[PDB]
Design a binder for these strands. Sequence first.
RNA 1: GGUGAAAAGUACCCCGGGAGGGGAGUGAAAGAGUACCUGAAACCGUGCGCUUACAAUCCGUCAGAGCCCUCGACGUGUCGUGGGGUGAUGGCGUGCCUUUUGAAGAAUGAGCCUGCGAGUCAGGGACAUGUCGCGAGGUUAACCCGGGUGGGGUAGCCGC
RNA 2: CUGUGGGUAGGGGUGAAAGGCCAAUCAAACUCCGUGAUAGCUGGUUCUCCCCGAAAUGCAUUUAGGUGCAGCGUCGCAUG
RNA 3: GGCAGCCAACGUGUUGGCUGGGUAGGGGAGCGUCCUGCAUCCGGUGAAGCCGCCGAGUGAUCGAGUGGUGGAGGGUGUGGGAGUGAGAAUGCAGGCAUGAGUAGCGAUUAGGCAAGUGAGAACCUUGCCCGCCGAAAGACCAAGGGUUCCUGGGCCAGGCCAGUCCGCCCAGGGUGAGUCGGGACCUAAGGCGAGGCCGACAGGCGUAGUCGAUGGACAACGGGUUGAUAUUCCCGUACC
Lengths: 54, 97, 114, 46
Amino acid sequence: AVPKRRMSRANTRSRRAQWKAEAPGLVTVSVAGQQRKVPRRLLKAARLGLVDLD
Amino acid sequence: MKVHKGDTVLVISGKDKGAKGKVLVAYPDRNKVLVEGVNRIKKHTAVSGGIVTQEAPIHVSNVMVVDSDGKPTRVGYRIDDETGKKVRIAKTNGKDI
Amino acid sequence: EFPSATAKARYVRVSATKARRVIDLVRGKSVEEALDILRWAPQAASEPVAKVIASAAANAQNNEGLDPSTLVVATVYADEGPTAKRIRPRAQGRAFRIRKRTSHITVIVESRPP
Amino acid sequence: AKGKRTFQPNNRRRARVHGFRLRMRTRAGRAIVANRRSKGRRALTA
RNA sequence: GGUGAAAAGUACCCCGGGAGGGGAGUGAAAGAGUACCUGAAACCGUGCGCUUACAAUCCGUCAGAGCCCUCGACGUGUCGUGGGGUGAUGGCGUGCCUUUUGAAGAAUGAGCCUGCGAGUCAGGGACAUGUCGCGAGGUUAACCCGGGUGGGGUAGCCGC
RNA sequence: CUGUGGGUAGGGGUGAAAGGCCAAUCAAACUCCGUGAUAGCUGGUUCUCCCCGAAAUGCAUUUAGGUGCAGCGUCGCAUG
RNA sequence: GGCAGCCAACGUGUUGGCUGGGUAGGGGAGCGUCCUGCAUCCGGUGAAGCCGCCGAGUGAUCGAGUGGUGGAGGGUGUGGGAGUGAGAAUGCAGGCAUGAGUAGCGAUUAGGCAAGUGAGAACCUUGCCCGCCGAAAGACCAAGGGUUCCUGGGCCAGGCCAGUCCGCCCAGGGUGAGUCGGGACCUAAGGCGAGGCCGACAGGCGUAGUCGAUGGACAACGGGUUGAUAUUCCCGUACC
Ligand SMILES: [Mg+2]
Ligand SMILES: [Mg+2]
Ligand SMILES: [Mg+2]
Ligand SMILES: [Mg+2]
Ligand SMILES: [Mg+2]
Ligand SMILES: [Mg+2]
Ligand SMILES: [Mg+2]
Ligand SMILES: [Mg+2]
Ligand SMILES: [Mg+2]
Ligand SMILES: [Mg+2]
Ligand SMILES: [Mg+2]
Ligand SMILES: [Mg+2]
Ligand SMILES: [Mg+2]
Ligand SMILES: [Mg+2]
Ligand SMILES: [Mg+2]
Ligand SMILES: [Mg+2]
Ligand SMILES: [Mg+2]
Ligand SMILES: [Mg+2]
Ligand SMILES: [Mg+2]
Ligand SMILES: [Mg+2]
Ligand SMILES: [Mg+2]
Ligand SMILES: [Mg+2]
Ligand SMILES: [Mg+2]
Ligand SMILES: [Mg+2]
Ligand SMILES: [Mg+2]
Ligand SMILES: [Mg+2]
Ligand SMILES: [Mg+2]
Ligand SMILES: [Mg+2]
Ligand SMILES: [Mg+2]
Ligand SMILES: [Mg+2]
Ligand SMILES: [Mg+2]
Ligand SMILES: [Mg+2]
Ligand SMILES: [Mg+2]
Ligand SMILES: [Mg+2]
Ligand SMILES: [Mg+2]
Ligand SMILES: [Mg+2]
Ligand SMILES: [Mg+2]
Ligand SMILES: [Mg+2]
Ligand SMILES: [Mg+2]
Ligand SMILES: [Mg+2]
Ligand SMILES: [Mg+2]
Ligand SMILES: [Mg+2]
Ligand SMILES: [Mg+2]
Ligand SMILES: [Mg+2]
Ligand SMILES: [Mg+2]
Ligand SMILES: [Mg+2]
Ligand SMILES: [Mg+2]
Ligand SMILES: [Mg+2]
Ligand SMILES: [Mg+2]
Ligand SMILES: [Mg+2]
Ligand SMILES: [Mg+2]
Ligand SMILES: [Mg+2]
Ligand SMILES: [Mg+2]
Ligand SMILES: [Mg+2]
Ligand SMILES: [Mg+2]
Ligand SMILES: [Mg+2]
Ligand SMILES: [Mg+2]
Ligand SMILES: [Mg+2]
Ligand SMILES: [Mg+2]
Ligand SMILES: [Mg+2]
Ligand SMILES: [Mg+2]
Ligand SMILES: [Mg+2]
Ligand SMILES: [Mg+2]
Ligand SMILES: [Mg+2]
Ligand SMILES: [Mg+2]
Ligand SMILES: [Mg+2]
Ligand SMILES: [Mg+2]
Ligand SMILES: [Mg+2]
Ligand SMILES: [Mg+2]
Ligand SMILES: [Mg+2]
Ligand SMILES: [Mg+2]
């Protein structure tokens, strides 16, 4: 099927609104004596040095 | 081009108007001359590291040659039939420059 | 008003609407918080925008000479840039158009009080 | 599953069917060559 | 096709792998940076003001509460011959064009913007009507002489 | 069956014949030219206001969705 | 209370009376655009264009009123001339939306890990596995292509993702023959064709000839070597 009418700005912006990203939730870790922020998923791997904190 | 290398010229128009100088190089096909002391520019040199200052050409119209008593002039031509020559004379005083 | 520093990144090979989708994460935040959020956010458009933010911070480091930790990303947005047009050949001799889009990311950060 | 397209390159045959010598030997060919020369083609003939 | 008058085309420093920028300089100007005169609209953002999640809306128009801005006056917040913005709410309200007896029509055409796209010209043509010159007359054609648009040219043509 | 080289050309070729094929096209290929072909047919034709304002009938028509003349509009003049 | 059309009266600009829906269509009077004769005026102390504000006209429209931007030409009067006005032609060109961050990302083999490189690695390099082809998905050519080959460098465009890689970009280099495959040898189908005959002309055929391989004749083999050529270079032994 094919769109019958060109779609209006309100209706275009209504579901262009749903295409968003969510910010990851960060927690603090201490590496080499200085504090960094990492996801809680990668907390252990940062605590034993397997994620590269730039 | 009626104005050559090496002859003193008074810049007659433009910002540096009122300045004597000497033509260091003539560009006959561009109607331009390069006369020292006037129309200076400030150019950036990528390096001896710094910013340079030299001259840039002025249109040959903007400058008039100087007489034998330091008065600007238009230049005409006389014929020296003794050698077939075509000599530059100063229209103001009637002698060469 | 607050003292401010600016940074612009033009002709970045990222769609404007795909840059905005990670710009909307970090608007109006401290510079360090924004850089962390971008560093752990799993969208590629973070790479340009992050750099731009960092660049602005450095300007306040080196041209306004103001405190690193007071910086907040006050304004950030992504303008459209030039588009290149290409052709993808399709079935039965059709030829469809492809847009290679770009962006200009602009950031102004301010040194607000704590 | 036949998939043979119409153009099959052959340098010699292209010469012997469209070349300079064949355009010249006839009369309409000399007309074509003169016409192409007048138009300004950088390549009068194959 | 269009930087600037002139390359004086951004030395040096800083972020970045570069691209790109920020200071500093050049310049009358960099809202002129070799993506370059002016830089419209469509289209795309960001910031602020008002509004909007019990509501059936050709999307306007008329009446209209509340809020916001602005101009006067008295004064110190409330009117005024006021002006803007937005609009809860109430009445009325069936796009444009073509073509049709009759289309909001579920007949055609049109996604949008910007630029472009259709009664013109020739001719002592014909007819009619204005206007001007001369007037029982009116006028020349080819042509000839004029660096001109001026002057000669009676062959013809129309009226009689 | 197949490669290489060659021959047949448009009212012509070729066809163990389907109007098949002849460069993704064939009840007469394609290109340029005549040429801005011609279409009683469809479409489109761009600023404003002021005054007036129809017809969809008759007659003829190789005519019937076209046109001519009449009727009916407007403007100018005459009459009143 | 304002306007306008027709008409009348005094009279010479007023007043009065009637009238003013409208398509096809007829008539009248005007707005805006551009080019120009003549006349005037404005403009780097900032023209046009554009964006506004505040206003104006009965309409097209106006603003020698004003600000912002801008950087060199404009206004007005009175005549002259128009490539003089668009919203529709399944109109033409360019730029950009809607669908939509959606479909797709091109077979029927399938990848993994360790290490390296690098700013960045699922995709590049190396190793070890696993799997697929194997009358091929291996080896060598013709036709066709044309530098795509090798070395060094690159990473903006291209690669349906990324790319440090690449048949992509850049520079330099690389193709060696008495014997291979052709010509200098030969002819077939056919092509052209001295003279020639035919045909109003343009031309049609064609003899002698001369081209024309897909065929006939004719002397080289094994090994080594370069990053890139190899019966070609070299080595050994041959043949014409
Ligand atoms: Mg001068
Ligand atoms: Mg990231
Ligand atoms: Mg195809
Ligand atoms: Mg398409
Ligand atoms: Mg088949
Ligand atoms: Mg300066
Ligand atoms: Mg300027
Ligand atoms: Mg541009
Ligand atoms: Mg510009
Ligand atoms: Mg409610
Ligand atoms: Mg209802
Ligand atoms: Mg309402
Ligand atoms: Mg209603
Ligand atoms: Mg119809
Ligand atoms: Mg109809
Ligand atoms: Mg009907
Ligand atoms: Mg419709
Ligand atoms: Mg409908
Ligand atoms: Mg129809
Ligand atoms: Mg349609
Ligand atoms: Mg056009
Ligand atoms: Mg005429
Ligand atoms: Mg055979
Ligand atoms: Mg052949
Ligand atoms: Mg047949
Ligand atoms: Mg073809
Ligand atoms: Mg075919
Ligand atoms: Mg035919
Ligand atoms: Mg025919
Ligand atoms: Mg004709
Ligand atoms: Mg026609
Ligand atoms: Mg009427
Ligand atoms: Mg009639
Ligand atoms: Mg009449
Ligand atoms: Mg009246
Ligand atoms: Mg009326
Ligand atoms: Mg009425
Ligand atoms: Mg004007
Ligand atoms: Mg004039
Ligand atoms: Mg003046
Ligand atoms: Mg100035
Ligand atoms: Mg003009
Ligand atoms: Mg100004
Ligand atoms: Mg202005
Ligand atoms: Mg006129
Ligand atoms: Mg026009
Ligand atoms: Mg238009
Ligand atoms: Mg259109
Ligand atoms: Mg288009
Ligand atoms: Mg879209
Ligand atoms: Mg969908
Ligand atoms: Mg889906
Ligand atoms: Mg999918
Ligand atoms: Mg694939
Ligand atoms: Mg690895
Ligand atoms: Mg197997
Ligand atoms: Mg086997
Ligand atoms: Mg193989
Ligand atoms: Mg290679
Ligand atoms: Mg690349
Ligand atoms: Mg890619
Ligand atoms: Mg490499
Ligand atoms: Mg390579
Ligand atoms: Mg030999
Ligand atoms: Mg023969
Ligand atoms: Mg002969
Ligand atoms: Mg023959
Ligand atoms: Mg031979
Ligand atoms: Mg052979
Ligand atoms: Mg090799
Ligand atoms: Mg060998």
